[PDB]
Write an enzyme that holds these catalytic residues in place. Structure first.
Site, PDB file in Angstrom:
ATOM      1  N   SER A 205       0.727  -1.354   0.130  1.00 26.73           N
ATOM      2  CA  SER A 205      -0.035   0.076   0.052  1.00 26.73           C
ATOM      3  C   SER A 205       0.824   1.239   0.035  1.00 26.73           C
ATOM      4  O   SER A 205       0.089   2.522  -0.471  1.00 26.73           O
ATOM      5  CB  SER A 205      -1.075   0.070   1.026  1.00 26.73           C
ATOM      6  OG  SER A 205      -0.178  -0.077   2.483  1.00 26.73           O
TER       7      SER A 205
ATOM      8  N   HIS B 223       0.368   5.249   5.985  1.00 26.00           N
ATOM      9  CA  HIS B 223       0.048   5.838   4.623  1.00 26.00           C
ATOM     10  C   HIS B 223       0.260   7.374   4.004  1.00 26.00           C
ATOM     11  O   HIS B 223      -0.307   8.216   4.911  1.00 26.00           O
ATOM     12  CB  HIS B 223      -1.461   5.322   4.082  1.00 26.00           C
ATOM     13  CG  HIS B 223      -1.681   3.845   4.323  1.00 26.00           C
ATOM     14  ND1 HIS B 223      -2.213   3.437   5.417  1.00 26.00           N
ATOM     15  CD2 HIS B 223      -1.336   2.848   3.715  1.00 26.00           C
ATOM     16  CE1 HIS B 223      -1.931   2.214   5.484  1.00 26.00           C
ATOM     17  NE2 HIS B 223      -1.382   1.732   4.406  1.00 26.00           N
TER      18      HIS B 223
ATOM     19  N   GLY C 257      -1.717  -4.523   1.517  1.00 30.54           N
ATOM     20  CA  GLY C 257      -1.822  -5.564   2.350  1.00 30.54           C
ATOM     21  C   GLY C 257      -1.051  -6.801   1.996  1.00 30.54           C
ATOM     22  O   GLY C 257      -1.005  -7.793   2.839  1.00 30.54           O
TER      23      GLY C 257
ATOM     24  N   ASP D 185      -2.889   7.506   9.670  1.00 29.48           N
ATOM     25  CA  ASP D 185      -2.405   6.486  10.342  1.00 29.48           C
ATOM     26  C   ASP D 185      -0.869   7.117  10.138  1.00 29.48           C
ATOM     27  O   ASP D 185      -0.588   8.051   9.674  1.00 29.48           O
ATOM     28  CB  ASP D 185      -2.645   5.243  10.062  1.00 29.48           C
ATOM     29  CG  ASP D 185      -2.331   4.792   8.433  1.00 29.48           C
ATOM     30  OD1 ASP D 185      -1.401   5.392   7.868  1.00 29.48           O
ATOM     31  OD2 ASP D 185      -3.171   4.054   7.927  1.00 29.48           O
TER      32      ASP D 185
ATOM     33  N   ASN E 261       4.197  -5.133   5.919  1.00 30.16           N
ATOM     34  CA  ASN E 261       3.318  -6.254   6.346  1.00 30.16           C
ATOM     35  C   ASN E 261       3.828  -7.441   6.542  1.00 30.16           C
ATOM     36  O   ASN E 261       3.030  -8.450   6.971  1.00 30.16           O
ATOM     37  CB  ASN E 261       2.278  -6.666   5.081  1.00 30.16           C
ATOM     38  CG  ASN E 261       1.435  -5.127   4.879  1.00 30.16           C
ATOM     39  OD1 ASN E 261       0.946  -4.429   5.815  1.00 30.16           O
ATOM     40  ND2 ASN E 261       1.350  -4.780   3.546  1.00 30.16           N
TER      41      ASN E 261
END
Ligand SMILES: *[C@@H]1O[C@H](CO)[C@@H](O[C@@H]2O[C@H](CO)[C@@H](O[C@@H]3O[C@H](CO[C@H]4O[C@H](CO[C@H]5O[C@H](CO)[C@@H](O)[C@H](O)[C@@H]5O)[C@@H](O)[C@H](O[C@H]5O[C@H](CO)[C@@H](O)[C@H](O)[C@@H]5O)[C@@H]4O)[C@@H](O)[C@H](O)[C@@H]3O)[C@H](O)[C@H]2NC(C)=O)[C@H](O)[C@H]1NC(C)=O
Ligand SMILES: *[C@@H]1O[C@H](CO)[C@@H](O)[C@H](O)[C@H]1NC(C)=O
EC number: 3.1.1.86
Length: 233
Positions: free
Chosen positions: A9, A195, A42, A192, A74
């Protein structure tokens, strides 16, 4: 010449949703080559492999093309509560097994997944560039915190073992974020600490390119400009 991007992402088109975007979206402006952004939100080195995404790039890549691989965000977590993304611990040939999605899955280490992908692409004549993951907001607490994850060094190790190029994207972004200051970097993270907004994605993309020119990475040959702020290292 085509440049393929494999990542998550932080690199993907539409980033992590709600107005964020990935850095791969801001690369094409600076290259005289076609850019194909195959990053997906993800994904880790494990799930990107399991979903057949590295294989699909292998199918279309031809001699002379570039493949830029950047994972890490991730990849951590615990295999006891397997989320389908966490890689097996270790730096080498270690193997883990876990039941995920109805399959007793064979899980490799983060470096193993990247090395295997590099070997598929390299055998066809593509130029592979492993890149360390981008940093999470280092100004999150109001003061600058420099804390790389194990995946930063793991990517470097993978490039060494596979015999391909390595670009320390992490360091170049953290270096520029440090010079940008608290107020500015915080504005790049709208929802957050991971991102980036379109402005932050542009900064991240420029930092990758700064790393390329400074280190002499092969991608230099399709770079349209070298005018980027910051310094080498
Ligand atoms: C590094 O840069 C930081 C960002 O530039 C800077 O922090 C900002 O500082 C300014 C100036 O003092 C503050 O402005 C003032 O804000 C208050 C209202 O503050 C409160 O409300 C905001 C907004 O709340 C809503 O929106 C957010 C984001 O979408 C949601 O999370 C939330 O649920 C609401 O919907 C909120 O962001 C503030 O939160 C901070 O403060 C609390 C403690 O007080 C912390 O728990 C939290 O971690 C955060 O620090 C706060 O609840 C307003 O009344 C004034 O008029 C003025 O506009 C910003 O609020 C502040 N922003 C943030 C994210 O902190 C730092 O000062 C700088 N760091 C250092 C060390 O210098
Ligand atoms: C998964 O396979 C390995 C050997 O390939 C085996 O040792 C392990 O017990 C299996 N896990 C389960 C839950 O069956």
């Amino acid at each position: 010449t085509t440049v393929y991007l494999a990542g998550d992402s932080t690199m993907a088109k539409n980033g992590g949703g709600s107005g964020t975007n990935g850095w791969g979206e801001y690369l094409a402006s600076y290259l005289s080559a076609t850019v194909v952004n195959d990053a997906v939100a993800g994904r880790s080195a494990r799930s990107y492999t399991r979903e057949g995404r590295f294989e699909n790039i292998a199918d279309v890549v031809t001699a002379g093309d570039y493949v830029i691989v950047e994972f890490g965000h991730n990849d951590g977590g615990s295999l006891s509560t397997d989320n389908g993304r966490t890689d097996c611990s270790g730096t080498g040939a270690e193997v883990c097994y876990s039941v995920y999605d109805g399959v007793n899955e064979t899980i490799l280490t983060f470096p193993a997944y990247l090395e295997n992908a590099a070997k598929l692409f390299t055998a066809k004549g593509a130029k592979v560039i492993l890149s360390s993951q981008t940093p999470n907001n280092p100004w999150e607490t109001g003061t600058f915190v420099n804390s790389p994850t194990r995946f930063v060094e793991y990517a470097e190790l993978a490039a060494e073992v596979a015999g391909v190029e390595y670009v320390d994207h992490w360091s170049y972004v953290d270096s520029i974020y440090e010079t940008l200051g608290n107020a500015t970097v915080n504005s790049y993270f709208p929802i957050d600490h991971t991102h980036t907004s379109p402005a932050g994605a542009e900064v991240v993309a420029e930092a990758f390119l700064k790393a390329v020119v400074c280190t002499g990475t092969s991608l230099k040959s399709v770079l349209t400009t070298t005018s980027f702020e910051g310094t080498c290292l």
